[model samples]
Target: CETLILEKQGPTLVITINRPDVRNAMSLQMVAELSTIFSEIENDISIRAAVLRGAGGHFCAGGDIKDMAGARSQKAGEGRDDPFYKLNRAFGQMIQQVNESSKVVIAITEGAVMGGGFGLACVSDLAIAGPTAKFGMPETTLGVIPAQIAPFVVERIGLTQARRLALLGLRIDATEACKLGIVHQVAESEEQLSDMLNQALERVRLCAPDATAETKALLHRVGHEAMAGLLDDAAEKFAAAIRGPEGAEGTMAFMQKREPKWAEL
Candidate 1:
């Protein structure tokens, strides 16, 4: 609870980064805690989605300055403490987990979505931004690089757009962010953003959680993964899914022309 405020809004876990004094910049503790949270929540069947946001108006100003300093000052040796590589790589591993997570990860971004924050948004299942949201890859402007976040940025918006943003360190408003495919929706106001989240959760409630998870995993295999045997693997998965509880009820409801059990919100 030191760096994050976790609230269960029904099946959605609201994870708020709590360091408002520093614009909710991610300290090392924040990164570690977030990694743990995602790991621990894997088996929590009650949680349908994780709603990521910041305590203050900003999402994340990027990694904390103190954490960055700690990494910079570390001495690398064969068997010595190398906080630098570990610290940076830890964030990347967290991002990968979030991207490959079974549950839906929705980002409700408002202000200062930059650097790692920008990368996080890119990996979310849905990124809904308020009017105040400003997104950018401003690492180069600060004499640094996107580093751990570059790959995800490219994955989300493509290499062409990523190159431009990273090179120029240009900041974009919510509307431009939407056009660039960084944010799925740009809410006109806070009220609209709230409504947008509610609507997203409502839709999530109607979906079969496990089915979604399986679909996400299968889709992520595109581009990077091999094509051979993929179809056979999918067919095997399809057979198992048909025998799964969700698949049974899903089709049963379809035949009956009624809502599935999961939709009984």
Candidate 2:
């Protein structure tokens, strides 16, 4: 069976991690599928937004521990390197692809969102979870560092919180996840989650596509920049935007009391 499932509802692409039998634990095949799919999502103009979720009841449990054990038992040879290097790079690329997509990415998380799963939520533009959802970084408890997820995790929740989570392998509830800024919002029920997703998509549709893309890009660029260095970078980016066709159309629409063409659709 396919490890990843892709679906579309109008302009929204829904990506499901489909191994519910394992609580959606990510296997090598799953990681590769995600990497390929997200690379395509980067260029797919037809998709304006995306929702990532798990099949059945729970989100991802983490990397497949069974697979990990098998790899550990393999004999090393000159032609073969440690499987960890390959898997680590692949997972990191998957996270980067999602993080760098032009479209808004929302993660609908519930049940166990641990280790790698928690990393996925962190890189997502927005993460919505149920009140009972579980979040944790349990890699250390398994005697492995959360290497592939470390940087992105820190980027999302800051160093102090990331430090606490990683070092102690702490598990937090959805409410606490929100308080730590790991989750954007907490829904009381599945119905409320659906409503929140629709509301988010409505807002996305109201935005000018190019402007939205540029805004997302700007956020990424400045995210890594030093404050003093970003002043010039920010000024240039802003000037480029206001002079671009999309920005001009947006400005004119506001001045003329009309809707931009992108928003009109």
Candidate 3:
């Protein structure tokens, strides 16, 4: 509970991603902490439902770009899989744990939720976002595609919105995200979000914990293997993207202090 602040809110476990300085970005440290917490919760029979949130008015910014840059630099910035596949493997394990857990998991999203953040939210059973919350998969803009987390996102928002967001790296407000089925409900503010979450938690609490666990396990088992192929295909596409013209253009634009041709066009 050190990296993540965990509180027992009634029958639900309120897990807050507690890195506010960079909009609660996920790092290796955070990932390690979260993996521990999820493991414990899965073993604990008393905690029925869970709520995942980020501190300081943001859900999650994504993976630590600073870390990614360092990895990229260390690896000589060659292939897409050089830095991404490693992250994908780590994040995939965590997301799988979250989705496979028996307890109901709700995502309390606010402010910005982008990149790997969208993938994280999709792992939860429900995502309640503030109207001002921004969401997207902007890895392509960064000279990468959303690799590790694309499969889950596509499953949540479907292929149409997924293709648009993943390919174009578009950012949309909470309203647009909800319309695209990324968010279950949109709240006006943090206070409203809190209230809505309480209501949802109560609804989850009404069901028997054991029965709820079984039901959730059933749902997860259904999609268990379908996403495996999707992830492999996405990884291939992402690897190619980092070596493609778009990647070259993005890197050049970033280094030259100029907009990319796509941005201008």
Candidate whose lDDT is highest: 1
Query: Judged by TM-score relative to the true structure, which candidate is superior, 1 or 3?
Result: 1
> Tens-digit lDDT track for model 3 on 1-265?
5568889866688888888988888887677787788888887866878888888988888888777776666654345456656655778788778878878889988888865567778888888998778987778777875777788878888897788887888888888888888888999877888799878876776555554665565455455567677567556655766677666666787898976554431
Model 2 error, position 47 (Å): 1.5
lDDT of 2 by residue, 73-129 (tens): 776533327665765677888888779888888999989997567778988888999
* TM-scores for every predicted model: 0.94, 0.89, 0.77
Question: What's the lDDT for residue 130 in model 2?
Answer: 76
In model 2, the runs with Cα more than 4 Å from the true position are 73-80
> 1 or 2, which is superior by lDDT?
1
Order the numbered candidates by TM-score, best leading.
Answer: 1, 2, 3
Evaluate model 1: give its TM-score. 0.94
Ranking by lDDT: 1, 2, 3
Tell me the deviation in Å of residue 243 in model 1. Answer: 1.5
Q: Which portions of model 1 show Cα errors greater than 4 Å?
A: 78-81
Summarize candidate 1's per-residue lDDT along 1-265 as a digit string, tens digits. 6889999987789999898898988777887898899998987888989999988899988777888687777776444257776777777888888998999999999899975677789899999998999987777887876788878988999999988887898888999989989999999988998999999999999988888888888889876667766767778888999998989999989998999987785
Evaluation by TM-score, superior candidate among 1 and 2: 1
- Residue 26 of model 3, lDDT score: 83
